[PDB]
Symmetry: D2
Subunit: 463 residues, 4 copies
Amino acid sequence: PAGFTDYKVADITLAAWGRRELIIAESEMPALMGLRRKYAGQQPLKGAKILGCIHMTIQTGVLIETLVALGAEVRWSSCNIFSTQDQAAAAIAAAGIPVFAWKGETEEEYEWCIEQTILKDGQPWDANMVLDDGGDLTEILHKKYPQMLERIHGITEETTTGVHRLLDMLKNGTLKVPAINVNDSVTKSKNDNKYGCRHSLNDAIKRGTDHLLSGKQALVIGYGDVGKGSSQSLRQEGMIVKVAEVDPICAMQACMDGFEVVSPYKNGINDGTEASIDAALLGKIDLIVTTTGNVNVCDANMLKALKKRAVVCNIGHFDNEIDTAFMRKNWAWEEVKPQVHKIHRTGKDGFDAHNDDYLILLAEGRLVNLGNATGHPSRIMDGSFANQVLAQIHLFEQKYADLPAAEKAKRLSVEVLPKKLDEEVALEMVKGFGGVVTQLTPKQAEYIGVSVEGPFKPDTYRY
Amino acid sequence: GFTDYKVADITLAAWGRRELIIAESEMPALMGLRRKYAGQQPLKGAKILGCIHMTIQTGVLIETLVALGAEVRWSSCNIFSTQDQAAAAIAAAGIPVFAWKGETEEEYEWCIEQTILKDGQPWDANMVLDDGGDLTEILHKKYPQMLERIHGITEETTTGVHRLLDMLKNGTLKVPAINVNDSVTKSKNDNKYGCRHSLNDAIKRGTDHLLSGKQALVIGYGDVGKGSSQSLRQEGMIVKVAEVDPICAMQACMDGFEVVSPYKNGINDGTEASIDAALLGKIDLIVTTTGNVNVCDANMLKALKKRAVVCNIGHFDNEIDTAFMRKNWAWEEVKPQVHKIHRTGKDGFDAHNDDYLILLAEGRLVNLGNATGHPSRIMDGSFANQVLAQIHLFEQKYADLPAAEKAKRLSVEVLPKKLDEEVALEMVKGFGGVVTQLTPKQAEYIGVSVEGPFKPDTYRY
Amino acid sequence: AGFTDYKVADITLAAWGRRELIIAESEMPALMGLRRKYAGQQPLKGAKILGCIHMTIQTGVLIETLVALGAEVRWSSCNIFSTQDQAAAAIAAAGIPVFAWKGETEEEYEWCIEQTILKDGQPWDANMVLDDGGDLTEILHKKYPQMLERIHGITEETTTGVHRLLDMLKNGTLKVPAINVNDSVTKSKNDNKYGCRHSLNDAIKRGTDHLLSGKQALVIGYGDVGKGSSQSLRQEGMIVKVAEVDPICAMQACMDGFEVVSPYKNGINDGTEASIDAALLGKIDLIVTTTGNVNVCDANMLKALKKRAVVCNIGHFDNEIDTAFMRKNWAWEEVKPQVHKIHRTGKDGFDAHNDDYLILLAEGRLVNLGNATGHPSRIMDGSFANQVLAQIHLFEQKYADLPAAEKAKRLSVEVLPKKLDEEVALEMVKGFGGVVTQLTPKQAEYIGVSVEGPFKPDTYRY
Amino acid sequence: GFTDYKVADITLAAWGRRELIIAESEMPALMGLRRKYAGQQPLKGAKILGCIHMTIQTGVLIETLVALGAEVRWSSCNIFSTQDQAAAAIAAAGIPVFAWKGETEEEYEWCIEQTILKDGQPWDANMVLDDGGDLTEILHKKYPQMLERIHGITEETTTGVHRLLDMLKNGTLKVPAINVNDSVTKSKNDNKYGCRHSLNDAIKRGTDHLLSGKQALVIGYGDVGKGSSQSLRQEGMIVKVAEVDPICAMQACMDGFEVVSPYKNGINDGTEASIDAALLGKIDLIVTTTGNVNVCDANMLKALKKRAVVCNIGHFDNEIDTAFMRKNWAWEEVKPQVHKIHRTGKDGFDAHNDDYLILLAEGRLVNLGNATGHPSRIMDGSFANQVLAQIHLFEQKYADLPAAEKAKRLSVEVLPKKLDEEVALEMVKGFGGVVTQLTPKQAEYIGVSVEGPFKPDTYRY
Ligand SMILES: NC(=O)c1ccc[n+]([C@@H]2O[C@H](COP(=O)([O-])OP(=O)(O)OC[C@H]3O[C@@H](n4cnc5c(N)ncnc54)[C@H](O)[C@@H]3O)[C@@H](O)[C@H]2O)c1
Ligand SMILES: NC(=O)c1ccc[n+]([C@@H]2O[C@H](COP(=O)([O-])OP(=O)(O)OC[C@H]3O[C@@H](n4cnc5c(N)ncnc54)[C@H](O)[C@@H]3O)[C@@H](O)[C@H]2O)c1
Ligand SMILES: NC(=O)c1ccc[n+]([C@@H]2O[C@H](COP(=O)([O-])OP(=O)(O)OC[C@H]3O[C@@H](n4cnc5c(N)ncnc54)[C@H](O)[C@@H]3O)[C@@H](O)[C@H]2O)c1
Ligand SMILES: NC(=O)c1ccc[n+]([C@@H]2O[C@H](COP(=O)([O-])OP(=O)(O)OC[C@H]3O[C@@H](n4cnc5c(N)ncnc54)[C@H](O)[C@@H]3O)[C@@H](O)[C@H]2O)c1
Ligand SMILES: CC[C@@H](N)c1ccccc1O
Ligand SMILES: CC[C@@H](N)c1ccccc1O
Ligand SMILES: [K+]
Ligand SMILES: [K+]
Ligand SMILES: [K+]
């Protein structure tokens, strides 16, 4: 880099390798590159200054350079201590883009990186847009830098957990800028959340352990979009997969999908006692994966009862799905290699190197697909990130922070993109596979009551 | 001395009753509604006009409604979907039913009319249960006065719901409706997993063809198209999928299917030159799933590989241009609901002609026409919703409201998620599944009650 | 004109059966290619074939190929429930002696076989045997040994029949050579496996119309039939567990993604109720036997099964399941033909609303043929092309005409050569529209084969 | 001061040892043999030259052979397959090993000759363990006097077995061999299920490409081709299969794949006109699995869809005409074992060129080159067989026998089924599987001992 020092990455000399991978990923992301080509001339993001907080992967690189290509300045950090691809961060920094991100941050460094996006030369940057994944940056602004939100036109939030936090703020009257729920586009939720975890969960388990999965027993906690994709990731490898759920509709889907639905607790009752644990069930499990976005769904008593040498991991947004704190307090951790630890249940101080009573924890309980592999593939993230670019254009052009008070009150909300845009994203994805979408005849369009151009479904439609 | 019915053969009743007793053990949600509401008789005074496939599963629905206090007069919503032993058992229990497998079009309309009329006069009906909207349409167009007495319509399927929403939009819908189709325990259970079970079932019964290794084209990839594609893919077919909706097409790709159009560039201009003949010439099986019109058209039928199987699992038989084939090609019956269509001409056929197609159920709903439709344990979810919707509307007594209040109440709505979850829980227990209970801390953490509902109404599952 | 040398359920079903034969011929390119290639040469002219195999539409195409090649035949089914009556009628209406209907009694079953053996009350001058399971072979050796002096060979279809032939060969009681048709790859690894994949869930749906997705199955056996059966149920979304006595087959089940379990605690079958894994069997919604062995779903297992479980057998003989115990102790309620509820509340009557019953399909006989139509034509194409080739080979070798010393040297149970197995497979592939690539001369030399094949050593397992 | 080795980085040894301790808990058949035979020391006096992929799994095999009394000297059988931490741990245990990931061809030969030679002269080897036949070949062609002391060869893989059988047919095989490949617990475990696990694993690690919805062509459908096709189909790829063997092609059709040829009508006449350009222009991924030569040839590589991935999972890299690509096209390294091959020409490339192919592992075994090969619990079966084979040939003592007895025993044999079964039983128990025991009556009924063998030698599984 030149006199440009406004970044922090593991190793800037990985930049050329990162550039090589970005050029490949561009060919895998036709929806995102289509927006680049469509809007480059109009510069719809000219004057936007975007605080971005999301896993600093190669896929995120293509997103960042699309926003910049459309006129935005950005300052970027990762939303997870383990999810950065260091060659991707290096390529972005070498392009002159402020990025503060490396694989293997401490918690203190994770907070520091987010603050380095917020501050430029020790004072708040004149941000006016936010892109977030999980709500951490959104939370830091509302709590520690509320003045900055006076100039911000909106937030575009990537993921289910982040959206939940936004909706709680909106209900409490504490959300200060409008948001777009990017997660609930169909080309995000039912693409990224499900098919992404199908690709990347068994990918990360293989890289982390190289264990044969076929013929072994898995327990997947949760059967939402991530749990659906995770269960398929394992079943298609030949695992015998059981599913836990609190939602009977999602449990019904798991049954019909061919899974046995079980609870870690006798009769499903989690009363906090060891006696409530179905030890017979847990003693047979070779792999447990948490997918819930909830708290403590693989708890201390479950970890005590798991089959020896079971693998434990989490593909939900936050690491508190597993009680890793209990394991930190009571058991000895033996690093196998980065983001793979054997947890010795024989005690706290030291271990027998040949002890047989351990669990294998991946990514210290952080998002396993990003921690132990590379997260979702470019062609899937293409859908999520075309939605992000559209969401950023829409909120920036709305200019919420400049509106009169009455107009602000009518626009202070958490919304999804219109279905027409969802379909236009999907169409580019289908063309990327070489699929050919049929066009309705006028009479056929009239018969089912839609425009030949779409949208083809009512907003109630679930796909 | 009960005579108020018409079935194919009343002596099939005891066989029907044996299968009803079995199906009850397969429908815990529906049977659970019997025990929960029997004491309270929530449908006492209800008089239900019902029009839906007169199968064994519909028999369990009928007797659940009667067990809760209703009187009913029943007909099937398709000419080939009735199981004659089911219709016999219902007739033999003293219930008016007018349905048999293999009705003519005239008999079909007559059967509906026999539910509407008792002793030559309109029955004092006050509730409607419909599957596809045919009964609803006849009442709005031919007996509008009976709608002044009816509290609501509970509609089973996507096509019927579309017809209701046309009326609500035109301001011509006379009573409120429940969209039963769009409960998750209906749409994502019946429409998808039901076709998964019953499509390859009907194709085997009708043809006994090996499916593994052969080429299929599924038109449509909504709930029925997803279930149908899986029905074929799990047998080892090489399945291709056509769609007009790019989101559904995207799901097909991600699900491992090649997305193709019958037409070059996807443009259906009506000409033979528009047809991808190389593609159509390779297809062994085409299945229509759309609820749309003429999605397997005459030029597609002309281009299909010799001895391809053609069938439809959408509600109505106009998805395939069977009118074209009746006019131009000779039909050779193999056995009931299986015809060879000889493309050599209309003036008879060579018994050993190689250039024919095999049509199943004359283009009518193939899973019900050539097999028995969805299995009991799946229809359990759909029909538990139907019962709850009937109670929901009957207890609100729309027809007793003044005109200004009816206007405010007039709608097409789904059942609240809380009922959808309650149905689902009974289905899961029937599999032996054990649902986990949230702790208070966990419920607060995700912002739900321990009792649910566990998802916002925006959630798509 | 006056043909009466048959017995079928209803001759008026002939036109229906012929419609289905014309369709099935278009699904059987290997067999129909043999018909086209050999009809003018008449390689079976003079052959007089006793046939005993399920009288299906597929068998009809096989029968008429043998006749088209010059043979005379006399036919019976090898199972009391497997005949398609419209197929039997069509064959009878063609003037071919056939004795077969769906729903024979055991006495009628034996009568039909003896009607093929005897013509006008006297032994037919048979010189060839085509068998499926060995019942016709057994009757000939026990009751009509003198007929075997004139028979050039037996072509045996199925694993169980082959085992009985090998027993006789070891004991010195086999009187004529046989071709093991089962162990062509285009038979065993086509028919036995993929056939059951197609037809097992087919028969369960037709007999019960039960949802299989989400329910628990136990498949006893993981040979070719157990592999195809397990897949038939898993592809429907059943949760499938597998039992095996063979650890290599058990290893395959594990790698294929199935949990391998035993009905008995620690796998030890001591004959007591206490050895039953009651917790396991109490969860099972469907048990399928696939072993060719005896009493692999036994009385104690039947007592422990989950209420309203389905019980069926897809092995060749019904003694895989202890149905005799059920006849002796429990009351049977017919639901419809080949579907019975077995009430475990007692023998003397039953409550019509009793919940403690099992559903037994086809009275424990081969369920895919008893409750549906067995394997589809395009699969049986492979099996029956092998049968025709095997019939031609043994007929042309003329074993019955050898001196005693030479008969002793020729008495064997053999398989068809790999080159023919490959030629059968090629026609099957073409029927799918598949395009097989041809080796270049240099490639053929590199891997040590002729460009035309055979492409694998005889040790190869596929 | 042990220095008799050569590895990338000896400081990786502790890491390698951690992974060996894990791998041992995943290999119950092989660790079972290690415990069973330790007291007897059946390989005391054995001096084994070993040439096989220096992975963690191979480390557990090496230490089993040493634990049973052998001395060994080891090399990898591929320039890319070594795991450097496994090689380090073995060297740090005092065992001669010459292996690293990313050898040159000259280094590859140097490593093998370092095992053959000790202190500048041929080692007194008396046993050979080989994977692919390269060590066997060098011994026969360059060190034939050493074979006078060697009791046998135990050969891991299909390609090496073929080379043994060619030698035996030509009279040039000098010592007996056991074909380890054809144990069922090797061939139908390693060759098939191992490639199912590790093919998509390598493609993900090398490219991170989405596979669902994309088009693959698998060349070959033997055991590796079957496992490979499943590896890709279970990810949602649309997989087409090519074969020269119509029986294997029949299996592909029945398994739900479309069987196609790169050449029009399957006829490879060496010209571009013979290529099915329409087919190859739609293929996103080509995988060769044959053990044959030039099955992804120059004309196919010219016709492949832009940006297609090309890889080989057969033993040797000549399945793909990489020599043509080296001569004619520019190579851009993406990262180790991943190259963009730019079809625009030889002398340089545009960094933004769109007309390239992605080659993995320079055409060498892709599961080992871009990932870690088969998992320990699969290699457990293969390597248990290897140990049994080494014990059997070392005990036969061929190198000591008189000439007539040699002639009786100069053969390529497989292990007996009883041992194949005992390996499988230990593998099943590792899954927690419970094998049922025959009753005496049942054993008699099917004609087997309660103890096995349970199948005749003809049985194909
Ligand atoms: N790793 C990834 O790449 C990735 C991708 C998308 C989302 N996520 C994260 O994954 C998490 C799940 O997201 P989602 O979109 O599937 O949400 P979702 O709402 O669709 O699914 C979560 C499911 O967990 C279930 N659940 C909650 N508590 C449970 C408990 N105690 N036991 C069992 N089941 C329980 C809920 O009933 C629900 O169906 C979120 O944190 C989201 O941000 C991760
Ligand atoms: N037979 C059964 O058991 C059964 C069960 C439920 C519903 N149905 C019926 O099946 C039909 C479809 O139901 P659904 O719930 O799947 O509806 P749906 O709206 O979910 O799906 C229909 C799909 O067809 C697609 N489509 C429309 N026109 C098309 C065309 N010309 N080419 C390609 N694709 C086209 C639409 O984009 C849509 O995705 C309706 O008639 C419904 O009543 C049948
Ligand atoms: N219904 C059909 O269409 C059809 C088709 C082909 C064969 N068959 C019959 O099916 C049977 C099986 O044929 P196959 O080719 O699969 O034979 P096979 O030898 O390949 O398989 C039988 C399996 O049963 C296992 N087994 C034996 N006893 C057992 C026990 N007590 N518990 C568990 N497993 C046990 C054996 O280890 C073996 O693997 C034979 O009777 C054959 O004739 C039926
Ligand atoms: N990478 C691994 O981990 C691994 C594992 C086991 C074996 N192998 C190697 O993989 C190769 C294949 O082994 P296998 O056990 O599957 O052998 P195999 O004999 O079972 O299968 C090879 C197949 O290739 C087919 N074939 C040959 N030439 C062809 C052509 N021109 N076009 C299409 N198909 C063609 C053959 O007909 C045969 O079925 C060998 O080199 C073997 O040593 C690699
Ligand atoms: C060409 C741009 C346009 N088709 C597009 C629209 C929406 C989303 C992504 C896109 O690439
Ligand atoms: C022409 C006949 C020939 N291709 C054939 C050979 C062997 C088996 C079946 C067949 O149909
Ligand atoms: K990635
Ligand atoms: K059949
Ligand atoms: K490995």
